[PDB]
Amino acid sequence: MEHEKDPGWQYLRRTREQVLEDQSKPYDSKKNVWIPDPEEGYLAGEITATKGDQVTIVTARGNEVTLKKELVQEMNPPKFEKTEDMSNLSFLNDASVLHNLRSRYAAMLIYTYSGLFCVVINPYKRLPIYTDSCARMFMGKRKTEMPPHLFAVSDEAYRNMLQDHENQSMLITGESGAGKTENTKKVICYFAAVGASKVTLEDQIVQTNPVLEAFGNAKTVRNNNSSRFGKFIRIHFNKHGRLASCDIEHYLLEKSRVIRQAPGERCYHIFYQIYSDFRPELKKELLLDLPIKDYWFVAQAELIIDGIDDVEEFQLTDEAFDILNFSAVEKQDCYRLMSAHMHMGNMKFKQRPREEQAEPDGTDEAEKASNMYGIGCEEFLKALTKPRVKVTEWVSKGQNCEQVNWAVGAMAKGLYSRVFNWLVKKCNLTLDQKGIDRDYFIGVLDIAGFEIFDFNSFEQLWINFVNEKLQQFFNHHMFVLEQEEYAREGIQWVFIDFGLDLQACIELIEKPLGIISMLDEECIVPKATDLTLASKLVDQHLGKHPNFEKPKPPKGKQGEAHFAMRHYAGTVRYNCLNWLEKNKDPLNDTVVSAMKQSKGNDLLVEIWQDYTTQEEAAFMTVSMLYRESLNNLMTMLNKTHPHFIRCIIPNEKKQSGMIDAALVLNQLTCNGVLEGIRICRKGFPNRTLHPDFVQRYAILAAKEAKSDDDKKKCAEAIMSKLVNDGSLSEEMFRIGLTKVFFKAGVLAHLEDIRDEKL
Ligand SMILES: Nc1ncnc2c1ncn2[C@@H]1O[C@H](COP(=O)(O)OP(=O)(O)O)[C@@H](O)[C@H]1O
């Protein structure tokens, strides 16, 4: 044809010869089954005997086991090998979902539908499925008429927007390394392609990527180019489909990374880009006269990334600034602040014997940082070692070396955070051009899933709270669609909103004197500590809220913990150490004041404009800003039609084609996929329009099938015969106004009788 000529088609759908070979395997619906297996998650076997509540099974490895029947899962026939939408399987169970995804992944078919979910398993290699010619194949095509692909989901959202006159959202989730960033970039490019009719808006949208990834992405153990911030990117269009504008919102930037690197990790890419040989004189202008290995804040672990050329990356970043209309002075002032950060991390201090007051231990690095900030080194060091506190008089407050080091790290994190916020805001101004009406938008949300670590803190609480909200959002969306379908089919049975399954945990976190409220209140109580917070939380909730628990003893390498919560993804042990400090984000106000007075670095003055000093003043916690931000995100998502992309990391080795079955099953458990298949299975997983049912099953009831001119009455007549024959129960189906609805396993049984009689 023409589809089959494109190189991407072999990575989208098997040939007829590969399919017939897939379907050419021995199979007995009553013999071949799946059993639990520690290594492989599930293992194929054959029932050789059955005895009451038990079954004897020879597994694929040859051994013989005896199991309770409740552990045995039905295996799908080979005609369902590599099925494109798993809600079509005859048997909707965990073992079959795992098998189908693994079979597709082995053939580098990385996209699979699962009803409302689009699952994508990271290929860890280049696939030719994202080219212009591949994208054009999906434009205007019915999603059900094309193989699974990110572009089919994207094009359906775009057509929905135009035909339904409603905003859309694309929610992309998954663990670190699963593929979120890559999918997000390709979605944005697809929308910029379909919405495009001497520097175009589309060009500038794309150029945000090098800038935002230089300052917001870093090498981690899990991912060489890990985005350390969540993001919501809205692509605005007029009512004719024309690209109009784009805006970006960022969430939870990882601030600790600019002062600390764990083994195997790097700081944000930008420091190594600036230092690279792309612009050799830049190091000299920035007074970066030591090897990069000697700058403590960026050199605690790795300095290079296998496969990444920081020279070429910096060229792309430096050019992107220009394309995005940053001025030469803005760009240089930005680079100077990055230099200042590296110099600050190398400043040393000491105390003389029996002195509590820190003094500089040499001043060369402080002078270089001050030069980058455009301020005097003496006032900078005085602000740092002897800050002033208003109490109606300015008093000087002494600092020891521990306090100075704390203050330097806090300043460096808060200054970097504000540079990043400024880069986003500047991008947003560039991308907001005159010309095209902003009638609708599609919002792309890319943020990490649940995080359950050995040690869970304030940052994990917020990301897990976010994901409770997002999973409830999915559950509610699924519930509304089911309810609306039954309603218009005249089959309404009354069921409770699936989103209520997450509401108790959400309330524990978000209600008055729930977790966040108690933190906000305690953070301002004189003499309060992390321990008084924790006792208050236990006092308010333990034994009164079922999702609040005392934590298990530190098994394995779990740290100490003050309380535990039962999240959607499991039980999380939280440690409240430093939560009061994290919630207030205190800075050295005297240092900020000196920076806001700088005459040598206008960008430095700009990025502190959101901060009010003591002198300017003469309360908003972090969680209050986060709560407002999340509430605004959710209010907006609930005024859109959402689409769901679930990225899966296949293994821990960045190995293409290899599946770690335990790791994959765990993600499918925690990301809603397996629970969605269960909920599907327990309802009416299958629906067939009356005419197609009549043609499908006439042979089982040929007189009934032709008994009436009205196709609905013919379908009813067939079903009445099956119920009369005993080969169907009235409970197993429902006749709708336009479709027949089938409980789990009922359609397959009807296929069995149809094939037998055939
Ligand atoms: N669809 C894909 N095609 C090619 N490579 C991919 C794809 N998805 C992920 N990768 C690879 O895996 C790495 C991690 O993916 P990424 O999207 O950065 O994960 P996440 O953003 O979820 O942390 C990428 O840098 C890239 O090498």
Numbering used by the authors: 1 to 197, 211 to 404, 406 to 632, 651 to 790
Tell me, in the authors' exact words, what the paper reports.
Subsequent studies in C. elegans, Xenopus, Zebrafish, and Drosophila confirmed the role of UNC-45 as a myosin-specific chaperone, promoting the folding of the myosin ATPase domain as well as coordinating the assembly of thick filaments during muscle development. To better understand its myosin folding function, we established an orthogonal protein folding assay in insect cells, characterizing the interplay of the C. elegans muscle myosin MHC-B with its cognate chaperone UNC-45. Structural data of various functional mutants clarify the role of the distinct UNC-45 domains in this process providing important mechanistic insight into its myosin folding activity.
To this end, we used the motor domain of C. elegans body wall muscle myosin MHC-B as model system and co-expressed it with different C. elegans chaperones in insect cells. Finally, we crystallized MHC-B and determined the structure of the ADP-bound state to a resolution of 1.9 Å. The motor domain adopts the canonical myosin ATPase fold being comprised of the N-terminal, the central (upper and lower 50 kDa region) and a C-terminal domain, with all residues (except loops 198–210 and 633–650) being well-defined by electron density. Indeed, the nucleotide binding site of MHC-B is virtually identical to that of the human beta cardiac myosin, with the sidechains that coordinate ADP present in almost identical position. Upon elevating the actin concentration, we observed a 6-fold increase of its basal ATPase activity, which inclined from 0.043 ATP s−1 in the absence of actin to a Vmax of 0.257 ATP s−1. Using similar stopped-flow experiments, we carried out a broad kinetic characterization of the MHC-B myosin motor, determining the rate constants of ATP and ADP binding to myosin and the actin:myosin complex, respectively. In conclusion, the kinetic data demonstrate that the MHC-B variant produced in insect cells is a fully functional myosin motor, which exhibits similar kinetic properties to other muscle myosins. In contrast to the human protein, which has to be produced in a special mouse cell line requiring time- and resource-demanding procedures, the biochemical and structural analysis of MHC-B was performed with a recombinant protein that can be produced in large amounts in insect cells (15 mg myosin per liter cell culture) and is easily accessible to genetic manipulations. Considering the high yields and the overall similarity to mammalian muscle myosins, including the human beta-cardiac variant, the recombinant MHC-B should represent a valuable model system to address the assembly, function and regulation of muscle myosins in basic and in medical research.
